[PDB]
Each structure stands twice: as C-alpha cells, then as structure tokens.
Amino acid sequence: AIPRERVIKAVNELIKFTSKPEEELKKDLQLIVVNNKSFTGTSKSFKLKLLNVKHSFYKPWKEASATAVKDFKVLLILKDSDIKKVSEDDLFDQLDSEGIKVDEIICGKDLKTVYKAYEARNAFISQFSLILADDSIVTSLPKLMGGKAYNKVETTPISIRTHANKEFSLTTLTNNIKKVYMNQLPVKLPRGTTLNVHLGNLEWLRPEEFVDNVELISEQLIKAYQIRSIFIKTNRSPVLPLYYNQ
Amino acid sequence: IDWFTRHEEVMPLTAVPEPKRRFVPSKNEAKRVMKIVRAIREGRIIPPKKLKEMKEKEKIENYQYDLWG
Amino acid sequence: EYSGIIYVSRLPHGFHEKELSKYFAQFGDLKEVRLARNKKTGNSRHYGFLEFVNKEDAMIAQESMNNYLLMGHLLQVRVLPKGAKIEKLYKYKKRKQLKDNMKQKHEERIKKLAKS
Amino acid sequence: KFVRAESIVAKTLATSREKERIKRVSILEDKKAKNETQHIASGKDFILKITEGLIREKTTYDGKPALLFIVRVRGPLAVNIPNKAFKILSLLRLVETNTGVFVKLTKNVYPLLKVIAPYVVIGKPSLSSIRSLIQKRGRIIYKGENEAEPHEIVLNDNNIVEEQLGDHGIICVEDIIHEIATMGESFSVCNFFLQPFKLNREVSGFGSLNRLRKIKQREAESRTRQFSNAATAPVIEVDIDSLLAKLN
Amino acid sequence: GYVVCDSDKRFLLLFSFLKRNQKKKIIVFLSSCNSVKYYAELLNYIDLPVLELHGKQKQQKRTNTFFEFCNAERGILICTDVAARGLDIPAVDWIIQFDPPDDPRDYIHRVGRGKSLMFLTPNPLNEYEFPENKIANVQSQLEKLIKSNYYLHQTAKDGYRSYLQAYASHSLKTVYQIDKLDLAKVAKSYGFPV
Amino acid sequence: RSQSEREEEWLEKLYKKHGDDYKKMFFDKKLNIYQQSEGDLKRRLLRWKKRNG
Amino acid sequence: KVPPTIAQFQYTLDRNTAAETFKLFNKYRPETAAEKKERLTKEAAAVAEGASPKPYAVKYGLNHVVALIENKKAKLVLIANDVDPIELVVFLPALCKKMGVPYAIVKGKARLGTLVNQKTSAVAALTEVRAEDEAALAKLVSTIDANFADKYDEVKKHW
RNA sequence: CCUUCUCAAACAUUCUGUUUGGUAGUGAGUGAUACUCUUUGGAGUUAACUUGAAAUUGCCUUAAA
C-alpha cells in the first residue's frame, strides 16, 4: 500500500504546475500512468475495468460541463427487447431522484441503419461521454459503432447488468446505472505495458478527496495485477514517481 | 447556349409564408378518422379485427350442411 | 497522351486484388494488378492500380467506370499519362539485471521536479 | 455470361463472414473439448427450439442420444461455403438442396452441428413423420439388371430388404423404421442404405400465385430461421412435423 | 476589439461565448428589435437564461425587467442598439456587438465609461483568436427545431427578414449587401434562405 | 354550443399537467400536438371551466 | 432536326445509376388507397376506444414539383422523356439548372408510375428523407451530377 | 447490392446482489512527454483532434427466362 503523504506531495505540487501564468484538457485532466510486466499482452481486449471509487467524479463532471463548452451526455445501448419495453420517463422518474439523467437510449438497430454512415456516426458518438451498453450486445459493438469510437476512454462502452437472472427488469438497471455512475471509474487494457487512468477533472477533486481516489485505485491494481511502476502526470508534465515496485 | 441558367438561382421565386398546416398533424386525415369514428358510432362500419371474427366463424363451416334430405 | 496503367480509386470496403483482377478481366487481357494496403493491418487504402495489355482497352474502362456507383460510393477511375509505372504496393497482411537500471531510473527521475 | 460488379463483392463479403464465423466456432469448441477455460463465452451445449406466440425455449443438451432429421435449405444469399462446410455437407451428402437425412445427435455430433447451421435446418421428427417419410420417399442404390446399379429407384419391395441388408434381421421396410426410430446397432448401415430423400421444394414454380406465394413464404423463413452468427450460437431446432406437411 | 468569422458560424460562435461565459454580466448588441425576439426565443428554448429588450414591447414591461438586470449579478440580456442607448450600466465587462452598429462613428464614443469585440467577414484595441473546432454542435439540434414548432419558424423568419433590411438601411459603403445569402440564413440555420 | 368529447378530454390533460401556464402549454409537444396559439388554448379552457371546474 | 431544348431528353440516365435511383425511390412509396383506408379504420377502432411524426414519401404532381423546385425544397427530381405533349416538361430541366436543384432525366413514364401508385407520372421528386438514407441520397446526387450533368454539359447545344 | 458474435457461468436472492469469462477496428493525416523492451535495428504502448464511406504507389440453383 502507498503512503497518503507522497500522493499529497504529488497532487499539490501539480496544483503548483497547473497554476502557471487544449487548455480545456491540459489543465483539467488528472491522469495517473501505470506500468506492468506485460498487461494482457497477447489479446486485444476492449473491456473497461470498473474501478470502485468512494466519491464520484461524474456528479462533479455533471456541473462543469454546463459551464464549459461541451455537454456531458449519457448514452444507453439496449437490445431490441427493452427499447420496445422502456421509455426515458421511467428512467427519469427513478434517476432524477438522484439527479442523473440518461439523455438518449439507442437500440442495436439504430447503430446500423440510421448512423451507419461513418460521418454521422462520428457525429453521433463524439457528442456523448458516458457510453453505456447492455450486456447482450456489448460483445457485438466494434462491428457496429466503429473502431474510432474505441480510441477514447469515454466513448468505449460499459457492460451493465440489466437482467434479473435471465429476464430483464427495470429495477436491475436503475440501481446499476447509479453503481457505475457515482462509484466507478473506467480504465482500458492495452496489450502493451503502459496504461494510464484518466482520473478526471482537476477543477473538481478537492485534493484531499483526490488522494482518496488514487490510493483506492492502487489497491485494486496491485491485487489484480503485477505492476512495475506508477506515475502521476498532468498532461505532459514531468512524471512523478508515486509508487515503485520491483 | 444555356445563357440565363448559368447564373444559378439563390432565394426562391416567391416569398409566401408557409402555413401552420404544414406542421401540426394534418386535419384532413384527422377529419377523415373522425368520420369513420362517426360511422362506427352509428355502426355502419365494422372494425377489421371483428371482420376476421366474422370470417373465423364463417369459412370453416364449408361443405357442412345437408343437401339431399 | 494516355498510358496503360489505371488509377482505380475510391474502392468499396471489401473489394480486393482478386475481385479487381476478376472483374477487370472482363474487359480484356490485364497485365498486373495490386491494391495498396496498410502495412500494420492487412486492409485496404481503397485505391489500386491495374494495367491492361491493350492501351485501347484502358480507356474503354475509364469511359465506362469513371463515375460508376458501386455499393456505397462511386468509383473514380483514371488512365495515366505516359510512363509512370505501377510500383511498390506490397501485399501486406495482419503481421535483476533490469532491476539495476530501474533503480537508476527511479533516482534519475526525481531530478525532474527539481528541474521544474 | 457477364458478371456485374455488384455480385462479386457481395459474394466476397458474405463468405468472408462465414470464413470468420466458423473460424470462431472452430476455435471455441476446440477450447471446450480441450478444456482450457480461462476466457470463453459459454461452457455448455445449447439447443434452442422455435415453435408457436413465437416461442424461443432455449435448452441445454445432455448426452442422451437423439434423432435428428436435417433438410438442406439454400441459405444465405451470397455464400460460397468454405472448405470446412463443403466437407460436412458432403459427408452427410446433403449437397443437393431440398434433400434430407436422419442422423443421431451425440456430443461428438453436436460440435460439428454448429458448423452447418446456416446452410440447413434441423430438428426432431415424430414417428409418423419418420414413417410417412420413408414409405413415401425412398431410394435404394442397388444393382440393376447386370451392369447399371446407380438407378436408385424405389423402395418397391421388402425382399430387396432381404437382399442387401438381410442378415441383420432386416426383413421388411417396416423393420427399417424400427432401426431408425429406435437407435439400433445397424442404424448406420440402413442409414447408408437410404441415401437421399428428394423432398420437393414448396413453391416449385413461376406464375401468378407462384410469385406471390414465393414472396409470402420467403419471409416466413426469416422468422422461423434466424442466423445467429455467434461464437456460442445455439443450434436452432424447428418442428419437423409441420415442415414435412409442407414437404410431403 | 473584434473577432473575424464567416456568416455561417457567427451565431454558432456566439452561443459558444455565452456558454463558456456564464457568470459575468455581459451584453450583446444586435440590430433589429425584431431580431432579438428570435435570439431570445432560442436561448430560453435551448436553455440559457437570457434577458430580452426591444421596441416591440411595452415601456415599464421593458423598464422593470431591465431593472432586474441592473440589480443582478450573473446573467445576460439581449437588447437592441437603440433601446439601450443612453442607459449604460457600469456593472458590465463584455460588450460584444454582433452587428455593425446604427451609427458607426458615434459608437466608439459610447464605449468610454466594458470590453469590446465585433464580428465581421470583409469589413484602440486588438482582435482575439478562436480555435475553430470548439463551436457547439447545436446546428443539428436547431434545424430540427426550426422545423417543428412554426412559432419558432415564424420568429426565425422575421429575425431574418428584419435582419437584412437593417443591413441594407445602413450608412457605410463597406456594409452594403455584398454578403452571400447562403450563409446568413445559416446564422439563423435554414436549408434555403427564405 | 358545446365542445366535443375528445376536445374536453384533451383539455383535461392540459389543465392537470400545467395549470394556467399558457406559454408552457403551447411550447409543449406531447399534449398540444396542433401548435395552436396562447389565445386559442385559453379561450377553449374558459369554455371548459364553465361546463366543469 | 431537333431544337437543342428538345433532345436534351433522350440523352437519359444510364443502366446502373437508374437502377440505384429506384433502389432509393422504391423505399419511398406513397401509401396506396387500400393501405391508407385500412390504416384509418385501425385509427378509428383504436382512438374511439383507447403522436406520430411526419412520414416521408415521393412527391409526384407536375404542379407540386414545379412548386418544390424554386421553393426550394426538392433535392432529386426525376423527369420522364416520353410525354404526349413534350412542351409540358421542356422548361423543367432548365428550371432545375437555374435554381440549382439536382435533376435526372429518367427513361420511361410508366417506370415513374410504378413507384407512385399511378399509371404515369411524367415527373417525380424526393423532397425529404429518413436519416438513414440521407448519406445515400446525397451520394446519388453526386453520382447523378457526375454522370448526367458533367458528361452532358453540351446538351444545351447541338441540334 | 451481402448486413454485422443481441449472454455464458458461479455463489448468494430482497421481486437482484456479488463475482468471473466473452468484443481482433473505414482509410488517410496532425499532434501534445512519458512508459517499457531488446538491440540500433524499432517493437509494444500512453492525451487529444480533423474528415462527404475522403484516397495518385511505404520491401448450393425454381433469386430460371
């Protein structure tokens, strides 16, 4: 386990480096780079490790996207069974009770007929930020929503359990979407050794809370993976050695 | 020599306002339904689901009657 | 003037040298065909060259396929000027001793915050 | 005759689905048989039934040997079958469309059954459908007068039954039906004795009604047969009994 | 002092500069009192809390609601050149004029009491930069929206008919009807320029 | 002269949803389908409030 | 001898482009008299006991099309060459060229009639489209402008 | 003128949780310092952005006639 105090000396000296006399991303993007003796080297996965986080950075990301130029929007990809079954009003009635809001639910059909053009698909996908996807069709998507949409960590979808033991229920999705939203952070898995965790918005993450997020991630990485070196980095800063495995 | 048409046009040739009839869903069909509502209110017309039920009882009872006595 | 090598461009996704050789055999005897692919992954950059042995037969094809709409997007095709041969479109497909240096590199790296 | 450029790409891209489709299945059941589950989709045998409101009762498959009758269908549109499916359809000699055969379903048979699923339709038949198939269609490749055997002609007799098989107790054509409906030991010999069943095609013509009945029935295949294209695609079973009324 | 932009994205740039700047008392100056019906009606319907001042409304209706801005802290009003003349609030920092003003000569004189920029394709202070791929992609949202309500279609129309009349009824030799109408319709987002 | 059954039932939907916010009522899409003005909707509601509450 | 505005027809759209035009246009059939009637009886049976967006179709009246070009609302316009009074449609390719609306002379008037629930149509146009076929429509616009317009720029000349 | 892997398991149930496994891409181009590796050959990687589906060459048969 890592000390809390090196991370505090890591984050606040980057608060120094961000307080200097593109800028929407360079100042704002807290990311942390993780190295391994060969992450998943031989197979090109696209899963997102949903790292459990104590305090959300998405309800944070909810606000500052209204003050900044780009609207943070949430997608749900469903199969055919549910879209004929469920409306946004049922989602809105049981998620605004928190205050989270699904903007658009999209069938598997709609990815292949009404956004099949590469131009319109890039126009459709690049708007959204939280791409969620129901599990039945999660495994069909890189034919559907393109390869360009999997270059990011936003636009790559998240598999989410919507079936209450083999049958769909709305109750199952409604508390699970909150589970991914406020408690979870994605990170992808390249078959390289380098991996970053784009932790999020530097305008948010009051840096005592931010250290709580960083240390909790380092728990779920060292247990799940062998690791070599860990670095925190505001976007192309000097890299800061936080943890040093051998 | 395609002389006048080489200078390609910009605004349409009119300036007429476009009516509200080209937006909210159309009166004509809405009037026509209301008449077919009226006729089934008077019962001149059967709905198509019961016409299958008129054809379900019918058309199986075929060749099922006495012809000599 | 015009020469024998052709510039078939704007090719549909899923249309390779074989089908390029097969379909353009229909016009006559065809010299040699490639298609330009990405080196890293064996997929096409959607423009390719072929040559007929008859310089007559080339501009037959160009006057038949210059704007020929083909499953999504029309093929743009070009005869070429004299010389300027087909060249180089290879058929690509989908292709504690350390601990000494990392102990060196962990200590070297701390100088950088002191640098800035 | 001349080939339009529309064709050769559509044929390319459809088979290069099937070249990708069976590759994944051939990798999977390799890892199912060799038992190296670290990353698989599913870990068991799936057989789904589609009958009638359009029910989809997915089932498991135990080791219990069952009897399947398989009809060759001509699907899909632009698919030159690859080498891996030329073989199975030739080993079942289902190379003619609208031709059927009974086979036995084991756990040796089921993995190869996921190969040919888009090219045929399968299912469990009934005894009536067992019986009314054979005594109404039946070919026997047997010697003619002296030279010409391959007149396959007809299950005319019960003493031709004495002739070729005979010594396995195979005495009459009704006795053959005992060897198929019940898994007998000489089941494969009598299965090798009745080589096709030349079923008729349903639409069977051009014309006024025939164009329409073709169109109305062609969409009916698109509901009663779905093409899963999945790694752990189920094997889809239809009712044979209602199908043979359409085919006899 | 100014921002050089083409007529397509003039409005689209403005919606960017409003959303990024949502804390400051800022004023836009537009020409027609008919027009700021339009740009007010969008922004309350694409959900920016804007304010609206124009000749086509009553006096104390104009005044008491203008009074709300003057005692405010955060928001934004849209007004004409004419109705805001003589009544400058010192509590302001951004004066962005979208149009060439009514009097171009006497316009500089009304500054000096408030930072300024304008918008011009062919037509003291400096300019600003703009990174071109940052403008909001609401034109997809708007074109559906300009076709769906007819009230918003009518007010788009009057916001266009009255925009160009005022553009012709102006002083300067520069600002005289050279501009192509394919792109000013896109500032109000049409397929065809009415 | 009275109002039709559909018209009355449609006005019930509008009144229970908004109340007396005619601006919201005409910018509404789901209930007010035919994009009628403020003056049209309020007039018909006044007639509705005479026969009913 | 033919005066250039006549025999601006007969230099029609070719085999493959015409096939692809109908591949688009046959998607956008007007709802036929029988289909429309049964839909309204479905509406009668449903709405009397216990929402829809504007549906796209081809536009097919000569007056309606001559309205739509110069409105401007038309995107693609198909024009039959065989017309009993030819003078009915001779101005129409020039009108499209002047207003900048992409047009194509199709071959066969009954061929237009098939897609439109009529005997003959003389002119057919597609004003608006569903989102999925938008890119396909605009591609066909470029396909027609390359094949029809750019090849026959000299169609305004030569007797 | 083809139309694309629409869920498997395990444990625990509250009317669904927990856990594991399953996804091999249109192309081109720009580009922010870092990570590993072996060996100077470059390999695998790590923000972000552009683009009409763009482009001028890296060594089976009745879907018959």
Curated annotation (Swiss-Prot), chain B:
Kindly list the places in or outside the cell where this protein is found, as annotated in its UniProt entry: Nucleus, Nucleolus; Nucleus, Nucleoplasm
What does the miscellaneous comment read?
Present with 2680 molecules/cell in log phase SD medium.
Describe the subunit structure. Answer: Component of the NOP7 complex, composed of ERB1, NOP7 and YTM1. The complex is held together by ERB1, which interacts with NOP7 via its N-terminal domain and with YTM1 via a high-affinity interaction between the seven-bladed beta-propeller domains of the 2 proteins. The NOP7 complex associates with the 66S pre-ribosome. Also interacts with NOG1.
Query: What job does this protein perform?
Result: Component of the NOP7 complex, which is required for maturation of the 25S and 5.8S ribosomal RNAs and formation of the 60S ribosome.
Regarding protein family, the annotation reads: Belongs to the WD repeat BOP1/ERB1 family.
Name of the featured protein: Ribosome biogenesis protein ERB1
The source organism is: Saccharomyces cerevisiae (strain ATCC 204508 / S288c)
Swiss-Prot record, chain C:
- Ranges for domain RRM come to 4-82
Q: What's the main place this protein lives?
A: cytoplasm
Taxonomically, the superkingdom here is Eukaryota
Mind listing the UniProt keywords for this protein, alphabetically? Cytoplasm, Nucleus, Ribonucleoprotein, Ribosome biogenesis, RNA-binding, rRNA processing
Q: What happens when the gene is disrupted?
A: Essential gene. Abrupt growth arrest prior to substantial depletion of ribosomal subunits. Fails to synthesize the 25S and 5.8S rRNA components of the 60S ribosomal subunit, and exonucleolytic 5' processing of 5.8S rRNA is strongly inhibited. Arrests at cytokinesis and fails to assemble a contractile actin ring at the bud neck.
What subcellular compartments does it reside in?
A: Cytoplasm; Nucleus, Nucleolus
A GO cellular component term found in this entry reads: nucleus
User: Does the keyword Acetylation belong to this entry?
Assistant: no
For this chain's UniProt record, which GO biological process terms are given?
Answer: maturation of LSU-rRNA from tricistronic rRNA transcript (SSU-rRNA, 5.8S rRNA, LSU-rRNA); ribosomal large subunit biogenesis; rRNA processing
GO-annotated molecular function: ribosomal large subunit binding; RNA binding; rRNA binding
Described function? Involved in the biogenesis of the 60S ribosomal subunit. Required for pre-rRNA processing and cytokinesis. Associates with the precursors of the 25S and 5.8S rRNAs.
Quaternary assembly? Component of the pre-66S ribosomal particle. Interacts with NOP7 and RRP1.
Tell me more from the record.
Present with 4280 molecules/cell in log phase SD medium.
- What is the protein's name according to its record? Ribosome biogenesis protein 15
Q: What is the lineage of its organism?
A: Eukaryota, Fungi, Dikarya, Ascomycota, Saccharomycotina
**What stretch of the whole protein does this chain cover?**
88 to 214 of 220
Curated annotation (Swiss-Prot), chain E:
PTM summary: Phosphorylated by CDK1.
Q: Motif Bipartite nuclear localization signal: residue span?
A: 9-25
Q: Where are the transmembrane segments?
A: none
Result of mutating residue 109 to E?
Lethal in vivo and leads to 70-80% of wild-type ATPase activity, a 2-fold lower KM for ATP and a reduced RNA/DNA heteroduplexes unwinding activity in vitro
Q: What is the superkingdom listed in this entry's lineage?
A: Eukaryota
Q: What is the effect of changing residue 49 to S?
A: Decreases the amount of 40S ribosomal subunits at 37 degrees Celsius
- Could you tell me where this protein is found in the cell? Nucleus, Nucleolus
Give start and end of each Helicase C-terminal domain: 1-146
Assembly, in brief, is: Interacts with RRP1. Associates in the nucleolus with the 60S and pre-60S ribosomal subunits. It has also been isolated with the nuclear pore complex.
User: What does this gene product do?
Assistant: ATP-dependent RNA helicase involved in 40S ribosomal subunit biogenesis. Required for the processing and cleavage of 35S pre-rRNA at sites A0, A1, and A2, leading to mature 18S rRNA.
* Extra information: Transcription depends partially on SET1.
Give the family per the record: Belongs to the DEAD box helicase family. DDX18/HAS1 subfamily.
Domain notes for this protein: The Q motif is unique to and characteristic of the DEAD box family of RNA helicases and controls ATP binding and hydrolysis.
UniProt name for this protein: ATP-dependent RNA helicase HAS1
Q: Which residues of the full protein are shown?
A: 267 to 481 of 505
From Swiss-Prot, chain F:
Signal peptide positions are none
Sites of Phosphoserine modification? 2, 4
Domain of life from the UniProt record: Eukaryota
List where in the cell it is found: Nucleus, Nucleolus
Summarizing the function annotation, the protein's role is:
Involved in the biogenesis of the 60S ribosomal subunit.
Q: How does it assemble?
A: Component of the pre-66S ribosomal particle. Interacts with NOP7, RRP1 and RRP15.
**Family recorded in the similarity comment:** Belongs to the NOP16 family.
Q: What miscellaneous comment appears in this entry?
A: Present with 2860 molecules/cell in log phase SD medium.
Tell me what this protein is called. Answer: Nucleolar protein 16
> Origin organism of this chain?
Saccharomyces cerevisiae (strain ATCC 204508 / S288c) (Baker's yeast)
| Gene name as annotated | NOP16
